[PDB]
Symmetry: C3
Subunit: 104 residues, 3 copies
């Protein structure tokens, strides 16, 4: 595989939601560092859909090749954009900030 | 709730689509200034889905807690990304612009 | 139509995914230069959905007016955000890059 071309593909189609560096930050999507040889939905600090959290497979060339071809087909129920916040604590904190920030 | 903590959440999951400050601009989503105590779909100058426009509830701790847990469940039909432009005149202006810029 | 207003509409609701200038880059969506008088899904260098690729209509005021009011109704199956990579080649390159970058 051509790593050089890979980078460019990532910048145009993935970077908007993903970071790859170690210690990288979470955005719309989880940080991808340490992806290979690891099971789906295990990036620390990120809240996945139950589907991505339980797909159960290990990310590698074969699995990635099939997933990236059609994510929704490989993992029915996965969501690429905001679909809500599960943790009650998280929602509470967000709402606290909102009651303050939107009340200038 | 924790205001600080909530800000990091907003920045990571909401900022790309929402502004909170008074007079702040609409983006993909409506500016959220004066959210609390206001009825759904009432931000001046933003075109909501008929669903969000007519949900008929008032934004507050409880209503927001349920909505943020699962947006589309609370307001079936709500759209997070471009789903079209209702106003005929707006589509006309936009098209006149494209007619100019894409042929230049 | 009012081009000046049209430019404002495009900046707020289209710019994030589309460029218009000749030689413009492809982002989430395809560069739109040369849109008028061309068949759907004909932008060089962009991988459209089979739906957008074969809608078979010519982009003109009449067609755009309908499309812009409700895209998915006009072209069912069309996707506005990442829905997968068709070409096995790109997937291999992307995966080769990830293999390196995510392993820092
Ligand atoms: C935002 C609009 C995204 C774009 C564009 C891309 N991805 Fe993504 N990805 C996104 C989210 C929110 C999620 C999780 C969804 C869920 O169901 O919880 C993901 C997840 C992945 C994963 C799996 C990670 C894991 O299981 O730990 C991979 C491997 C992945 N995304 C890859 C990927 C690539 C390579 C992209 C560009 C081609 C890409 N994504 C774009 C959000 C978004
Ligand atoms: C990203 C979040 C987008 C936004 C916002 C807008 N568009 Fe888009 N558009 C996007 C994609 C990914 C695609 C292709 C979808 C597919 O099925 O492959 C498109 C396509 C168009 C087209 C047709 C291009 C062609 O036939 O060659 C047009 C005419 C178009 N989009 C226009 C457009 C305008 C004017 C927008 C704002 C009002 C707009 N798009 C937003 C992604 C996104
Ligand atoms: C991307 C686009 C987003 C993201 C990532 C978030 N929201 Fe927001 N939001 C968006 C839109 C286009 C709409 C309106 C949808 C429709 O018309 O059906 C909204 C609306 C809200 C609302 C209700 C506003 C109102 O009734 O006046 C709220 C309270 C809201 N969104 C909040 C919100 C928060 C706190 C987010 C982060 C967790 C968030 N959104 C993300 C679009 C988008």
């Amino acid at each position: 595989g051509d790593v050089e071309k890979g980078k460019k593909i990532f910048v145009q189609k993935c970077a908007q939601c993903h970071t790859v560096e170690k210690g990288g930050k979470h955005k719309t999507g989880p940080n991808l560092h340490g992806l290979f040889g690891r099971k789906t939905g295990q990036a620390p600090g990120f809240t996945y859909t139950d589907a991505n959290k339980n797909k159960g497979i290990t990310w590698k060339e074969e699995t990635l090749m099939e997933y990236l071809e059609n994510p929704k087909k490989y993992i029915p129920g996965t969501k690429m954009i905001f679909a809500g916040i599960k943790k009650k604590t998280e929602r509470e904190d967000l709402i606290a900030y909102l009651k303050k920030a939107t009340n200038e």
